[PDB]
Amino acid sequence: MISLIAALAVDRVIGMENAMPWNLPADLAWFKRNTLNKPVIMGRHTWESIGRPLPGRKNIILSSQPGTDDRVTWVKSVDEAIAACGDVPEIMVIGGGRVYEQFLPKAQKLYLTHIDAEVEGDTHFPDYEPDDWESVFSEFHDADAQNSHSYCFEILERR
Numbered sequence: 001m002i003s004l005i006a007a008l009a010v011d012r013v014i015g016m017e018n019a020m021p022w023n024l025p026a027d028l029a030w031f032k033r034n035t036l037n038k039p040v041i042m043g044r045h046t047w048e049s050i051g052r053p054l055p056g057r058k059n060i061i062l063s064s065q066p067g068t069d070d071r072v073t074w075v076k077s078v079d080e081a082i083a084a085c086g087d088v089p090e091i092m093v094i095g096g097g098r099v100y101e102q103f104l105p106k107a108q109k110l111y112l113t114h115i116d117a118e119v120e121g122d123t124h125f126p127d128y129e130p131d132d133w134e135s136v137f138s139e140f141h142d143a144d145a146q147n148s149h150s151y152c153f154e155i156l157e158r159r
Ligand SMILES: NC(=O)c1ccc[n+]([C@@H]2O[C@H](COP(=O)([O-])OP(=O)(O)OC[C@H]3O[C@@H](n4cnc5c(N)ncnc54)[C@H](OP(=O)(O)O)[C@@H]3O)[C@@H](O)[C@H]2O)c1
Pocket: 005, 006, 007, 008, 013, 014, 015, 016, 017, 018, 019, 020, 042, 043, 044, 045, 046, 047, 049, 062, 063, 064, 065, 075, 076, 077, 078, 094, 095, 096, 097, 098, 099, 100, 102, 123
């Protein structure tokens, strides 16, 4: 199955000028835990924003143009991306906006972090129909010395 993982600020903002303005170490730890030892699919802008391969994961980059780095796998279409993952139980789609839009109709599971922060951004998580999705896990955390905003981890399954 295909899963999406994302961190959303207020109004479903996920980025600004090809960056993520906030720093929430607990959420990056959640991201690592839920993606380690799985293939991750990302768009080219997100690859540039991360700036290096994610270790312990198969990194698959969507781009219409030839690959410029052989430490990761480059593919030209959604179907090629899925095929390059091979026969694994769970494929993790890690963004950005354009890629999330394309994979949402195929996805069975969403791993969402809702961050209580207002950010002026230029990229949004797709609008998803809430009737389609059941919450199966929810965990709220207040801000602390390490994480400057409160946040909620949620896992939704397609009904
Ligand atoms: N908060 C979060 O959870 C989160 C997660 C991920 C990313 N982000 C942020 O999202 C932003 C980037 O998002 P974005 O929407 O601008 O870009 P993106 O989805 O990361 O990348 C889009 C690019 O990927 C390629 N692509 C997408 N679909 C393709 C397809 N079917 N076939 C071939 N190539 C395809 C294209 O590259 P070519 O132009 O080379 O063809 C396209 O330009 C950044 O701000 C990032 O920090 C946030």
